[PDB]
Design a protein around this ligand. Sequence first.
Ligand SMILES: C/C=C/C(=O)SCCNC(=O)CCNC(=O)[C@H](O)C(C)(C)COP(=O)(O)OP(=O)(O)OC[C@H]1O[C@@H](n2cnc3c(N)ncnc32)[C@H](O)[C@@H]1OP(=O)(O)O
Ligand SMILES: [Fe+3]
Lengths: 55, 100, 488, 123, 29, 125, 75, 101, 494, 56
Amino acid sequence: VKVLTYFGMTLAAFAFWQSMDKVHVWIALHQDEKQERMEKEAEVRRVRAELLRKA
Amino acid sequence: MDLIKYFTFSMIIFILGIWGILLNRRNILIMLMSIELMLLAVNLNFLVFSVSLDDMMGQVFALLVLTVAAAESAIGLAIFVITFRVRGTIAVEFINSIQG
Amino acid sequence: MFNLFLAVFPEIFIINATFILLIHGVVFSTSKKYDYPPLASNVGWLGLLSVLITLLLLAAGAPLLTIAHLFWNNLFRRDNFTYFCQIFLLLSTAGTISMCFDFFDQERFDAFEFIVLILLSTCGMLFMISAYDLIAMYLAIELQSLCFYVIAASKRKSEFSTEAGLKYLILGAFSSGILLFGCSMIYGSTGATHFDQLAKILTGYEITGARSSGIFMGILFIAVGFLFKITAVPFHMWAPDIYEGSPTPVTAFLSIAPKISIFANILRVFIYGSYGATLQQIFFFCSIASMILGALAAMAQTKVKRLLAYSSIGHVGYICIGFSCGTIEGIQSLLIGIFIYALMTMDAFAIVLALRQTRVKYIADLGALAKTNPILAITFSITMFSYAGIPPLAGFCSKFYLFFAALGCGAYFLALVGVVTSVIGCFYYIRLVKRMFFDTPRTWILYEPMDRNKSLLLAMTSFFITLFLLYPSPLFSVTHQMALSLYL
Amino acid sequence: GSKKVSDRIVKLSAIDPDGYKQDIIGLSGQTLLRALTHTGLIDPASHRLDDIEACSAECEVQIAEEWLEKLPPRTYDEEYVLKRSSRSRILNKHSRLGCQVVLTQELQGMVVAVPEAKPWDIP
Amino acid sequence: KVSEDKNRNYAVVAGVVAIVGSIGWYLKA
Amino acid sequence: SPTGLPAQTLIDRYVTVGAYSLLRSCTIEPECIIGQHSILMEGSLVETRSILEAGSVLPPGRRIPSGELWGGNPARFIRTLTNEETLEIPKLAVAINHLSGDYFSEFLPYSTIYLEVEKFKKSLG
Amino acid sequence: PISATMVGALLGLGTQMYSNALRKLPYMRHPWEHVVGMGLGAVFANQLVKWDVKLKEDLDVMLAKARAANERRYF
Amino acid sequence: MNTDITALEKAQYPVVDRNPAFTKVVGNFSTLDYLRFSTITGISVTVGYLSGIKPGIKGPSMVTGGLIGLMGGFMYAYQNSAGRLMGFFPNDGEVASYQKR
Amino acid sequence: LEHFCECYFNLSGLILCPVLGSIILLFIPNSRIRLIRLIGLCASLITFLYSLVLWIQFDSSTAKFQFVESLRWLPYENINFYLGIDGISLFFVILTTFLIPICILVGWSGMRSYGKEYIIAFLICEFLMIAVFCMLDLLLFYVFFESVLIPMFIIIGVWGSRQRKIKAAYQFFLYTLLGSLFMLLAILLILFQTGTTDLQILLTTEFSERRQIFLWIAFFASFAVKVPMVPVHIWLPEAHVEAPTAGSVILAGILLKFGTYGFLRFSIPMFPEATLCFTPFIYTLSAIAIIYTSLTTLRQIDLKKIIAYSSVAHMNLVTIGMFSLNIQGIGGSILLMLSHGLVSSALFLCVGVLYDRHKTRLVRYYGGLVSTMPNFSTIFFFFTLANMSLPGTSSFIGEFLILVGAFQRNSLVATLAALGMILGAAYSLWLYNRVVSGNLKPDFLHKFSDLNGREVFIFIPFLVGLVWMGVYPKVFLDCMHTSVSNLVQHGKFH
Amino acid sequence: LAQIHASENSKSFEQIEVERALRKKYARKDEDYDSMLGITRETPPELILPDNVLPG
Ligand SMILES: C/C=C/C(=O)SCCNC(=O)CCNC(=O)[C@H](O)C(C)(C)COP(=O)(O)OP(=O)(O)OC[C@H]1O[C@@H](n2cnc3c(N)ncnc32)[C@H](O)[C@@H]1OP(=O)(O)O
Ligand SMILES: [Fe+3]
């Protein structure tokens, strides 16, 4: 490829990596919601088992 | 966020190796080179993990893997050379006689 | 200090003997004084002697292999299981080498380095069996694989041998990279590579909601590498092409020795380890796919070597069923199946190597063999009926356990697949008996009689196949012993 | 003596891979492959039986259309073998399996093209 | 009167030593 | 061969070549019987499941059709063989092989003549 | 009656004749080899029976350990 | 280098010396040890001779086989002697020269 | 627990006899035809005499397995196996030992081209078949039965007459293997409950109704391929026709009995509730097969295809009687089993005589053989009558006693089964008249020879056997009734 | 043809054994390993027939 094509590709990849950084920050920001959802679903399963174990 | 970025560097190298396998049906030399890319990505993971965990076991394996990569490249290029010599070409239509 | 190395006397001896044979072969093969003599058979006999002496050293010093276990702990672990696995591996190597002398002499394969590479791969498989860490496991696997890649392309002027070498190298390097990725993921997630440390960290949690995705994918990728190694579907397509294209002694060695070494590795990495049934489902689905594909593809084959390759794929499926069920009897039956399949495969390849002096290539080439060599046709038929699993032959044990585990573990689809695949296999095995006994071809092929080595080995394996079930207790007890040595 | 070997002799011509034409001789009732192996045009060791189950198209020949009319049509097994044994996996419309062609008196003067030999000696 | 192949003589002695050693090995084990 | 075909002498399986027969560049297809004192000349062919009578002479390039009985000097068609007759031929070959086994068992892999040569030398110094 | 030595000697004799027959040789081609094969078969059969006894003895101890470990759970 | 001879499975016979030196183990060789060594060396020399006739190097092949046999035979004898002295193998003879000496 | 019997004559020696014959023959040069023939014949004859002595010492008062003897498999003694017979299996052993020497005698003239391989195969078949009839274990029954497939495969494929033998042997092996695998699944199902596969034990273990039904269906699938039952009967025609004469004799006279014997030995007693629920189902399949396959027999044009198709109709009458679950039904089913093993074998022997001379099986080629082969014609007519269940012959005794047993349970199945009398007579007489009666056809056949001395002797024990059981079946019914009575009473206590 | 037959029939025991060994040594070939070794194995003259008896 031409030198300028290579450099334009490198600039595109730099933009892609900065977007990846934004994605990682977003995923980090939603840890608490995910743990809360996990806890609620675990409680659902445990209540269902304890009610089914009763019979 | 350091560790995730090092890991995604290794990740893109591994993914590029997979893609080189997928995209080079007619170019078995680049298939070999893609496999070498995958091996470099794993070697980097061991070094990055060794730094991250403060443990030297990652580095010992990194050196030994470099030895394995060297030997495997040597023998692979030997097999390439003999295949080329027998056929006079590297085209994949001449290495498909065994089938079924 | 010296006495610590009593734990590695067999490996030290075999490595040093291999070095001696390398030097001897290179010094006298290049000699003008002796007119550059072929040394494949001379070095082969000396290497068979070296293998037997290694087997004596290992077998006799059974307690001494566990000496200095704390000092050697971070390198390997020797116990009862590794002891018997290594003895079996050495016996398989010795039989394979014994079947090579007619090939060396009549084909004039004069390369002594073939024997040296077989010996080095045997050292590699010895180290594989005793591996107790991901690093050691990978290194021993790679030594083994590199030796195999070189020997598979040993007929360097042949289109078939070069093609087999190339396909082998590319696909094996791919799978090895996948497995190494798995090891790196496991190391990063747990900070450990020793099998004991991995056993402690993983036990008790499996998939408890908050599941380490790194450990999961490490297990997955390592399993993919192992499944490639045992020729399990869908990581199997290399095996038929490589088996066909390699020289027939290479095919014989690849069909037996590497299975023992990697099944030892599989049992020590996972059974000794701890994770969800996910891995057991992996091997279950691969077993089902392997039986189906092996049966159908073997039914399609017209050539003997390809048929044997697909038969081996089907049988590894049968064997992996025993790993999936996750019981002590599962491991026992897996070991019994590996043993019986190894003996049967050596029988079949002794017959194939005997017929390769006349260049047997097609199943149809066996026409009128019941007339031109009646005893040989009966011996091959006993082997084929053992392969089909017909009782009272030794091959019936694998079928019996396949159905036993299924009706116990509660599986019925598995029972159906086993029934259909067993019937298909019986058909394509008895096709060979029909060709040797029932057909009346216009043109016959008269085969040169085999040498003494292959006849003795054939006689012994045929007696074992027909008579093992009359006195099977030692195998049952030794396999049960090994299964328990893994845990306690 | 009433019955002679020359009664069964079928004249033939074969064009080798290098293009030079040779007059070859075969017995009617036997296969084209046997006539081709008499003079070594096809190596006899590469194809020892006249059976479709012992064929990897080592016996493959190319025949012009004016002689294909005079032969029985290719069966499914023959076309399967020819197609799989092609390097490009393409069936050649003028290709025949020599082990399946039986020489007859009606094939006098037929021209056959002998392609380059495929590898056959599996290690 | 005499066998002159010295390598063959050494090999004969080696075979004899192997046989006698095997016998003694059995008898003292 | 005058026929142009390869001139190797090929005696196929289950062929009984009667005593005092002369063969030269002839082909005998499987399951045939050649009568005693017969002559088969260059390029001649005897097709499968045929019988030649004793004293038969087959000129060069001549042919014996399959399933027939021929004889004479030169060989002439006599009659067509019944299927039971043709089934008898490999049985004759097998019986002759069985007889030859009795002779094969009379010889050990080595003779004892070398001892006679030894003593004949020793008496001669 | 039927002992390990007898069965082993018979199997060694059978192997030598089977090996001779596979090579299309006469059954009794090298009779000293038949003697050697009978000896080897007898040795192998006696050793196999002894080894089976030892293996069962070892398996009993190891199953004792396994059962002790498994019975530890109910304490 | 920290070393530890401790074996996984304990010795079943009286331990005469837990880590015997090289010279002591060699000096402990019995007539059975020299019989095993000589048998392995003789078999190896025989195999070297017989396998070397066809290439024409029976002499050098005998030497190579004898080297392999000497190595393996010494290894086997050293194994047996050291295992007797450490109590891994039945060693009534070693115990006699220990109680007495 | 060692169960060694005190009797001098026991099952072990009878088992060993043909094994010893086979081991002796492997080493005798094929050049020694006279010796090979005499060794095989003498071994088979000694086995037959031994079986007769086994009959002599039989107790007809007991329901306990007789001559019971055990063989150890492991020094752990967890898995121990037993041999024993009763009133149900004794006569099948005697029949096997009687039929094997006949098979050796049939190929006497062609033994120059057969060889030791022919005698060895039949001796190995004899040993395996006797073993199968003498087992008190579900697992050994499976092994020894599954083992009989290899020598039968060889016998069909090597000494069969035409190239159709390839397809015939393939179908035989594959059908039988499928059935055997289904039995294996049932044997493991039982083992998981019981921890053992010993017949004497499983006779004393209760099975749940649901598991009884499921175990019955797996045992059914195995036995119904061997009976044979519709629609898995189509392997029998090709297999029995394409086989050599002695092969056909063994296939129809002994091998067909394994399925009905498996119903009597295992399925019926072990699952008495499952047996009752499935009786209408068994009755329907059996009655359809008798009517359908008899009409098919009428339109067959091959001598051997007619005789082979006849066996399917006869075996499905046997199933009707044994599932009637009374004395007449089960006793009649066993008697027809043995009688069929004599009549069918003799009829296969008659056709083999004709095919050996003329090498054709098409009915249209023959005709008028009464004027050239009167001795063969007279013997052919007698066995033709015995195939129509004519009173005085042995097959009438089994046929009527089954119809009696079926009538007391279901009148409808007895009426449909009795239609075998009309149809069985139609094709049997049509076959006899088209072959033996009429005028010669010299364009097809002009050279004939009646039976020689060997062929006459072969038929004599068959003629004596059918007349003997036909007029005085008490010698057989006396030795069977106690075992039969306890089979019927099994599972109920009133 | 008489010349080759007369030559063969008059050979002594020692020459017969030498030529038996030569015939065994040159019965097959491994020209590939020879090329790896850089040598060319030639048929000895005692095993080569004169051109006047060959079919060509
Ligand atoms: C390099 C080394 C060279 C050597 O030393 S040779 C080695 C030994 N080889 C020989 O001796 C071969 C000798 N060749 C011949 O004898 C031969 O026949 C011969 C060369 C006369 C004649 O062979 P022909 O094939 O040329 O026979 P004709 O063409 O003359 O046929 C005439 C007629 O005679 C009859 N026939 C011919 N030949 C004979 C005879 N002999 N007898 C009886 N009847 C015969 C026959 O009916 C013939 O009619 P057809 O069959 O319709 O063609
Ligand atoms: Fe072909």
